[PDB]
């Protein structure tokens, strides 16, 4: 019944900066025994969370020592400065001092990089696939940083409307680059009626390349 | 040495119960309180319950009606069980190891999908390297996994032997009610022909077991 | 003194916990609780942590004594005399006292690898015992308190020794302190046919064997028995190992020896199997044998595998200590509090019972309330019969037990 807030829903941030994450909480997290039991944890992409602070200040054993936490009353901020790409995904605060146990809503750090230009890929369906009696054409978008781009399907120099659905990677936790891939599901008579099939890209590394 | 799995059902049927098995490994359940915690679609991580050494229980007052965790310390077990599982409740499970009153390791988690509908399989076709690229630089090649029911799913290249340059896709639900994703990789485009890549599917609700190769003609 | 059946409450319990040195206010967990009564004196100990009960910073061990008077309502409370306190309170563990010519001596095991039931592989014996002086004399010198290394240890075949109980007996001017005994499987003999498991579907013969340990692999198995401490020898303290009778026997768990009405009983806790309560009076004493009640009516919350009232050998290790005390040895009434959940350790009952009934109790705490640890211990002042239980309770606020202190007078009349 105790609410944890977190100020910043997203945190953009360029490796060597300083990060700074605040946590809110209802009511007092002070514990009869005096200590306040405030812990950060942090999740990163396809991984169950770690925990990184626990006690207001003290850093987990294998946290080094640039992650640093400091708190008065119910305002508690996480400070992370020199950040790295490895240091990137969901920080969450969480109160253990009064029973019911409670986290905070969450706040996803996301790391600024010079712009990165896509790579893409065609992908015809396959011909196993075909048998099942429906078409699938992949396009791919590879390593590229600014996440915002723009995929448009032409078929035989027709434009898509939504006969497509796309999905997106979390930020690489190397390089800090996005990757995107964008099918087109058609039923099968429609793959035959026509030869061309094409993906067109917007990104701002690129001019609009195209692909078959 | 410290592991904790979880074997869940993957799929619950509305108002009906959920069963969660966690078995530990590397250290004895007397020594340590366990917690239930769970994380559902996009909402934050919420705190089901804990039980202690000696047997002591306690719940998040919330799920108090419905939920109740056991466990046996000569198996190394600790039980999960859920009542009246609605909608609202489909979320991963993670089974913690406590210490002084924080979270030290945590289970791989149990991803747990409430819905009348049965599971399916999934179908693995391969998304063949362009026979296009080439002069030794990035050729491309992938699977697309299609058509499976229980949301999870897992793909690994060459049973974990390729780890560098892949990337595998969040899901996408289809209009039909099933997900699609796309698992693709980056090779060297002078090993077309020379390497064999495999592709290997696992969907544990399913027990589907897949391995596909992607070649060009 | 009642003996009759009934459902009408006439136990009233009071609380005298607030003369003992518990601070509700500072929030620590309060664990491993020792109550002992005898002769109109006490010892108390417990471990005073900061923080989460089972991994906690541990604060403050202490160990006290002090003479169990009349506050002024008729009602008995506890008033410590004498507290010593290690100065390293992560070591002791495994306190056991009994009481000797006012003087009270309390049998500890020192462990650097933690508790030795968990750690057992790791640890080496090392036993050592505190005696305070229940009435302490002014810098009289080693009487008010006196801490002793153990050196010399008799446990024959047994690999390791130590005490495994909250209270012991005397008998003339020789102690004898409730003990377990590690012994590694491969010397433990044991014929599965012994096992009964005739009316139990699911169970094999060889659970039994596999249950004398905490894991169906360990090394060790546990053996309850006592640890004798003749005080008329000189020279060296010499601790011998007596092992329990092989009648009816299970794990070797926290136990309790005591005298009632001249003659002494013995308690051992079900932390197996066999959930049905085990008390008796004791045969022998040297070559240790205990007359088990058949009782029908009390067991331990069991938590999974064996459950409350379960009798088929299963391999498991879970239970709570829940003593009773014999106030009637004609009609072997006894005394004691259980907790009113199969699976869970809630619902801290005081009951008067039988062998097959119970004859009158009152709930201790609300429905909710978490307790574990029960110690009750029964005696007799200004010729009527009082009980004093310790309740490990667990309180909401902070996620703490701490321990609770009641005093219950057995009514000799049962209609009020
Ligand atoms: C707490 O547990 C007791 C005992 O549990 C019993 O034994 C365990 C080892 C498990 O096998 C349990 O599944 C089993 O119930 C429960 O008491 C028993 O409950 C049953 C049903 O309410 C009572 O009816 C009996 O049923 C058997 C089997 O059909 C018959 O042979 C009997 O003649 C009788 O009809 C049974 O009397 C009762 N036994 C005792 C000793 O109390 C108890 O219900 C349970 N409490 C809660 C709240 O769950
Ligand atoms: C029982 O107690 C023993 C003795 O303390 C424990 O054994 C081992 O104790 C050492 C320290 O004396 C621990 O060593 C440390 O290991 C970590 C990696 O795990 C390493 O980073 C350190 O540099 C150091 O080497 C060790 O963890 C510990 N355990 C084992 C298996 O060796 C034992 O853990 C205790 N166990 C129980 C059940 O209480
Ligand atoms: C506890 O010890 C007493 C005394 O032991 C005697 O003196 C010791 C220094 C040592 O020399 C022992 O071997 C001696 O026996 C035991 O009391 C004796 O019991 C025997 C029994 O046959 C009797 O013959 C002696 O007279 C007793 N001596 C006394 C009373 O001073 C006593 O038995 C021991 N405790 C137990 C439980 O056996
Ligand atoms: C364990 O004890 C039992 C006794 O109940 C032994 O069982 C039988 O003992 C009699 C003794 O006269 C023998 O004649 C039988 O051959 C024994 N077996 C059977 C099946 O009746 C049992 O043998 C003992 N355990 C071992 C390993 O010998
Ligand atoms: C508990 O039940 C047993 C079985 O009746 C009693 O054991 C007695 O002694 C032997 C067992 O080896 C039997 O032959 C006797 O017939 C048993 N009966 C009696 C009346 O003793 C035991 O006495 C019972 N209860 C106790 C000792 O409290």
Redesign the interface.
């Given at each position: 019944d105790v609410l944890m807030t977190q100020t910043p829903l997203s945190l953009p941030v360029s490796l060597g900066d300083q990060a700074s994450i605040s946590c809110r909480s209802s009511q007092s997290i002070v514990?009869?025994?005096?200590?306040t039991?405030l812990?950060w944890?942090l999740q990163k992409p396809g991984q169950?969370?770690?925990?990184l602070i626990?006690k207001v200040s003290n850093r987990?054993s294998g946290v080094p020592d640039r992650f640093s936490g400091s708190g008065s009353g119910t305002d508690f901020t996480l400070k992370i400065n020199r950040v790295e790409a490895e240091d990137l995904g969901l920080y969450?605060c969480?109160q253990?001092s009064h029973?019911?146990?409670?986290?905070?809503?969450?706040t996803k750090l996301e790391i600024k990089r010079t712009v990165a230009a896509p790579?893409v890929?065609?992908?015809?369906?396959?011909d196993?696939?075909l048998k099942?009696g429906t078409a699938?054409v992949?396009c791919?978008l590879?390593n590229f940083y600014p996440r915002e781009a723009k995929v448009q399907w032409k078929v035989d120099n027709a434009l898509q409307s939504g006969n497509s659905?796309?999905?997106?990677?979390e930020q690489?936790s190397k390089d800090s680059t996005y990757?995107?891939?964008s099918?087109l599901?058609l039923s099968k008579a429609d793959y035959e009626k026509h030869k061309l099939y094409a993906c067109e890209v917007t990104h701002q590394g690129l001019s609009s390349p195209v692909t078959k | 040495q410290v592991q904790l799995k979880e074997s869940g059902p993957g799929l619950v049927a509305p108002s009906q119960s959920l069963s969660i098995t966690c078995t530990v490994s590397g250290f004895s359940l007397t020594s340590y309180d366990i917690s239930w915690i769970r994380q559902p679609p996009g909402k934050?991580?919420?705190?089901l319950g804990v039980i202690w050494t000696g047997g002591v229980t306690?719940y998040?007052?919330?799920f108090l009606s419905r939920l109740s965790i056991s466990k046996d310390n000569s198996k190394s077990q600790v039980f999960l069980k859920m009542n009246s599982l609605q909608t609202d409740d489909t979320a991963i499970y993670?089974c913690v190891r406590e210490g002084?009153?924080?979270?030290?390791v945590?289970?791989?988690?149990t991803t747990v999908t409430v819905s009348s509908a049965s599971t399916k399989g999934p179908?693995v076709?391969?998304?063949?390297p362009?026979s296009k690229?080439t002069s030794g630089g990035?050729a491309?090649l992938?699977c697309?996994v299609?058509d499976y029911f229980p949301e999870p799913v897992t793909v690994s290249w060459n049973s974990g032997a390729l780890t560098s340059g892949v990337?595998?896709?969040?899901?996408?639900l289809?209009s039909s009610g099933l997900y699609?994703?796309?698992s693709?990789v980056?090779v060297p485009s002078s090993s077309l022909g020379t390497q064999t890549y495999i592709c290997n599917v696992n969907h544990k609700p399913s027990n589907t077991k897949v391995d596909k190769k992607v070649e060009p003609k | 003194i009642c003996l009759q059946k009934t459902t009408s409450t006439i136990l009233k319990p009071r609380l005298i916990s607030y003369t003992l040195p518990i601070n509700t206010?500072?929030?620590?967990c309060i664990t491993d609780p020792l109550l002992a009564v005898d002769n109109g004196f006490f010892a108390y100990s417990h471990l005073e942590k900061?923080?989460s009960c089972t991994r906690g910073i541990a604060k403050q061990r202490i160990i006290g004594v002090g003479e169990v008077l009349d506050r002024g309502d008729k009602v008995p409370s506890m008033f410590m005399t004498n507290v010593w306190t290690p100065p390293n309170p992560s070591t002791i563990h495994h306190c056991s006292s009994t009481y000797h010519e006012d003087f009270y001596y309390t049998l500890c095991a020192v462990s650097h690898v933690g508790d030795p039931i968990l750690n057992s592989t790791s640890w080496t014996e090392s036993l050592s015992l505190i005696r305070l002086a229940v009435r302490p004399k002014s810098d009289s010198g080693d009487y008010n308190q006196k801490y002793i290394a153990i050196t010399k240890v008799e446990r024959g075949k047994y690999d390791k020794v130590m005490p495994y109980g909250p209270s012991g007996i005397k008998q003339g001017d020789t102690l004898y302190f409730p003990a377990v005994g590690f012994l590694p499987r491969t010397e433990f003999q044991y014929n599965d046919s012994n096992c009964p498991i005739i009316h139990c579907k699911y169970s094999k013969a060889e659970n039994c064997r596999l249950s004398m340990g905490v894991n169906s692999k360990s090394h060790y198995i546990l053996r309850s028995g006592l640890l004798k401490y003749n005080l008329s020898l000189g020279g060296d303290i010499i601790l011998q190992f007596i092992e329990i009778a092989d009648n009816r026997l299970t794990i070797g768990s926290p136990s309790k020896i005591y005298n009632s009405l001249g003659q002494p009983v013995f308690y051992q806790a079900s932390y197996s199997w066999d959930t049905m309560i085990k008390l008796g009076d004791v045969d022998t004493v040297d070559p240790l044998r205990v007359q088990w009640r058949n009782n029908s009516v009390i067991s331990r919350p069991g938590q999974s595998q064996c459950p409350r009232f379960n009798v088929c050998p299963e391999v498991c290790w879970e239970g709570t200590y829940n003593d009773a005390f014999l106030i009637d040895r004609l009609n072997w009434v006894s005394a004691g509090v259980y907790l009113n959940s199969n699976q869970t350790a809630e619902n801290p009952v005081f009951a008067v019972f039988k062998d097959n009934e119970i004859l009158y109790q009152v709930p201790l705490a609300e429905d909710d309330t978490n307790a574990q640890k029960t110690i009750t211990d029964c005696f007799l002042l200004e010729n009527v019969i009082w009980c004093i239980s310790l309740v490990e309770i667990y309180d909401?606020?902070?996620?703490v037990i701490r321990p609770k202190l009641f005093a219950v007078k057995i009514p000799a009349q049962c209609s009020e």
């Open positions: 514990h009869s025994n005096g200590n039991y812990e944890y169950s969370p770690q925990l626990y987990f969450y969480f253990a029973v019911p146990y409670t986290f905070g809503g969450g790579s890929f065609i992908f015809p369906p396959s196993e696939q099942s699938s992949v791919l590879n659905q796309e999905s997106v990677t690489d990757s995107l891939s099918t599901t | 934050g991580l919420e705190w306690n998040n007052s919330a993670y002084d009153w924080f979270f030290d945590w289970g791989a988690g179908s076709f391969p998304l063949a362009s690229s990035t491309a992938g697309l299609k990337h595998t896709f969040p899901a996408v289809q699609s994703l796309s693709v980056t | 206010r500072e929030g620590v900061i923080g909401t606020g902070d996620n």
